[PDB]
Design an enzyme around this catalytic site. Structure first.
Site, short mmCIF file in Angstrom:
data_model
loop_
_atom_site.label_atom_id
_atom_site.label_comp_id
_atom_site.label_asym_id
_atom_site.label_seq_id
_atom_site.Cartn_x
_atom_site.Cartn_y
_atom_site.Cartn_z
N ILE A 31 0.80 -1.22 0.00
CA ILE A 31 0.00 0.00 0.00
C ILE A 31 0.84 1.28 0.00
O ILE A 31 0.31 2.37 -0.23
CB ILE A 31 -0.84 0.18 1.28
N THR A 33 8.47 4.97 5.17
CA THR A 33 9.90 5.06 5.26
C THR A 33 10.36 4.94 6.71
O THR A 33 11.45 5.21 7.19
CB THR A 33 10.54 6.23 4.51
N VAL A 49 7.57 -0.60 5.32
CA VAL A 49 6.66 -0.80 4.20
C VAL A 49 5.29 -1.14 4.76
O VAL A 49 5.19 -1.63 5.89
CB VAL A 49 7.15 -1.86 3.22
N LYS A 59 1.99 -2.49 8.98
CA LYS A 59 3.21 -1.70 8.72
C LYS A 59 4.38 -2.44 9.39
O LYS A 59 4.28 -2.74 10.58
CB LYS A 59 3.00 -0.27 9.22
N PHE A 108 -8.05 -0.85 8.04
CA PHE A 108 -7.74 -0.44 6.69
C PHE A 108 -8.79 0.53 6.11
O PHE A 108 -9.98 0.25 6.21
CB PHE A 108 -7.73 -1.67 5.77
N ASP A 156 3.45 15.09 12.45
CA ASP A 156 3.74 15.00 11.02
C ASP A 156 2.48 14.96 10.15
O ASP A 156 2.36 14.05 9.35
CB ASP A 156 4.61 13.80 10.77
N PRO A 183 -1.42 15.11 3.86
CA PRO A 183 -2.55 14.54 3.14
C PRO A 183 -2.44 13.02 2.99
O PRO A 183 -3.46 12.33 3.13
CB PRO A 183 -2.45 15.21 1.77
N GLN A 184 -1.29 12.49 2.66
CA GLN A 184 -1.08 11.05 2.49
C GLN A 184 -1.45 10.27 3.76
O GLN A 184 -1.75 9.07 3.63
CB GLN A 184 0.42 10.76 2.37
N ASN A 185 -1.31 10.86 4.95
CA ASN A 185 -1.70 10.15 6.19
C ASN A 185 -3.01 10.59 6.81
O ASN A 185 -3.27 10.42 8.01
CB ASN A 185 -0.52 10.10 7.15
#
Ligand code: EFP
Length: 278
Positions: free
Chosen positions: A10, A14, A17, A33, A74, A119, A122-124
Site C-alpha cells: 500500500i 519510510t 513498508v 506496517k 484499513f 507530522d 494529506p497522504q496520512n
C-alpha cells in the site's frame, strides 16, 4: 506474522513498508506496517488506547524476531489521492468543511491527552466511503516532506507544542481549497522562506522570542506579509479568518483545536458523502 496474508503493498512510510493484508483467523482486511527499544514498545502500547472515530484504529502491535509490526484498521483511500482525483473540479466546500471539522475533533482528542501528531500530511489522512476522515501515523513520531512543517520546528525549537498540528492542518485546509500546496518547500531553508514570503518574515512584534530561536538568523531576508484574500482566494471570510488563526506565527497565539471547533466557519457544518472509486 504467520496469522496474516499479504495482499498488496500500500505504501512506504519510510518507517517501513505498509501492506494491505488479511487476518487468517478473523477474516479482517487490515494495513500491516513493518517497522526494538523498550521505550518504543511502551509508547506504542499507549497509542493502542488512543481510540477516536477520527483516528485510524491501531488493532494490534506484534513484536517477533525483534521486528515490529503495527496492525491498523484499513481505509481505502487517502486525502492526497482524493485531492489529485478531485483536481479538475476541486473538493466541494461542504466536504472540505466536514473534513476539516472531523480532523479538528481528532486533534482536540489527542491534544487533550497531551499527545501530538507532529507530522500531519494529506497522504496520512485516510477516508472511507461514509464521509469519515481519520488521522494516521499518529503518535509514532515520538515513538521512533517538509511542506506541512510548523515554523517553530524549522527554527529549531526542541520543545514544540500541540500547535504544530494546528499549523499542519491549516496548510492542508488551504491546499484543499486552492488545489495547490500552500508552502511547497524543497529544503528546510526553502520551506522557511516560502512561509516568510507569504506571511511576512516573523519578528518580535508578531512573534515574541522568535529572534532567540536556535536556527533564527538576523540575516534572514525581510519579506512583507501578503493578504489571505490573495493566498486562498475562493474561500469565504469565515474560512479565511479561521485559516489565519491556524497560521499565526506565535505558537501561543495560534488557535487550539477545541476553539477552532467553535469558530463561525463551522456554523453550517454538515457531513456529505464523497464520490470515491477503488
Ligand atoms: C490501492 O492501494 C491503496 C493505497 C492507499 C490506500 C489508502 C491507505 O493508505 N489506507 C490505509 C493506511 N492505513 C494504515 C495507516 C498506516 N500507515 C502509516 C505510515 O502509519 C497503515 C490504514 N488504511 C489504500 C489502498
Amino acid at each position: 506474522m504467520e496469522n496474516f496474508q499479504k495482499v498488496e503493498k500500500i505504501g512506504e512510510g519510510t518507517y517501513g513498508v505498509v501492506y494491505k493484508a488479511r487476518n487468517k483467523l478473523t477474516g479482517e482486511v487490515v494495513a500491516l506496517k513493518k517497522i526494538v527499544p523498550s521505550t518504543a514498545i511502551r509508547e506504542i502500547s499507549l497509542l493502542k488506547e488512543l481510540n477516536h472515530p477520527n483516528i485510524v484504529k491501531l488493532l494490534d502491535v506484534i513484536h517477533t524476531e525483534n521486528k515490529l509490526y503495527l496492525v491498523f484498521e484499513f481505509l481505502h483511500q487517502d486525502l492526497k489521492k482524493f485531492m489529485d482525483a478531485s483536481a479538475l473540479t476541486g473538493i466541494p466546500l461542504p466536504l472540505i468543511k466536514s473534513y476539516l471539522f472531523q480532523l479538528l475533533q481528532g486533534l482536540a482528542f489527542c491534544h487533550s491527552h497531551r499527545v501530538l501528531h507532529r507530522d500531519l500530511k494529506p497522504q496520512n489522512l485516510l477516508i472511507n466511503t461514509e464521509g469519515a476522515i481519520k488521522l494516521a501515523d499518529f503518535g509514532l513520531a515520538r515513538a521512533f516532506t517538509l511542506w506541512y512543517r510548523a515554523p517553530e520546528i524549522l527554527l529549531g525549537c526542541k520543545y514544540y507544542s500541540t500547535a504544530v498540528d494546528i499549523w499542519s492542518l491549516g496548510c492542508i485546509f488551504a491546499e484543499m481549497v486552492t488545489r495547490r500546496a500552500l508552502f511547497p518547500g524543497d529544503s528546510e531553508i526553502d520551506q522557511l522562506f516560502r512561509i516568510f514570503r507569504t506571511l511576512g518574515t516573523p519578528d518580535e512584534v508578531v512573534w515574541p522570542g522568535v529572534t532567540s530561536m536556535p536556527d533564527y538568523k538576523p540575516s534572514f531576508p525581510k519579506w512583507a506579509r501578503q493578504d489571505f484574500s490573495k493566498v486562498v482566494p475562493p474561500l469565504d471570510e469565515d474560512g479565511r479568518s479561521l485559516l489565519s488563526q491556524m497560521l499565526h506565527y506565535d505558537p501561543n497565539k495560534r488557535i487550539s483545536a477545541k476553539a477552532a471547533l467553535a469558530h463561525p466557519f463551522f456554523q453550517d457544518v454538515t457531513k456529505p458523502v464523497p464520490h470515491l472509486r477503488l
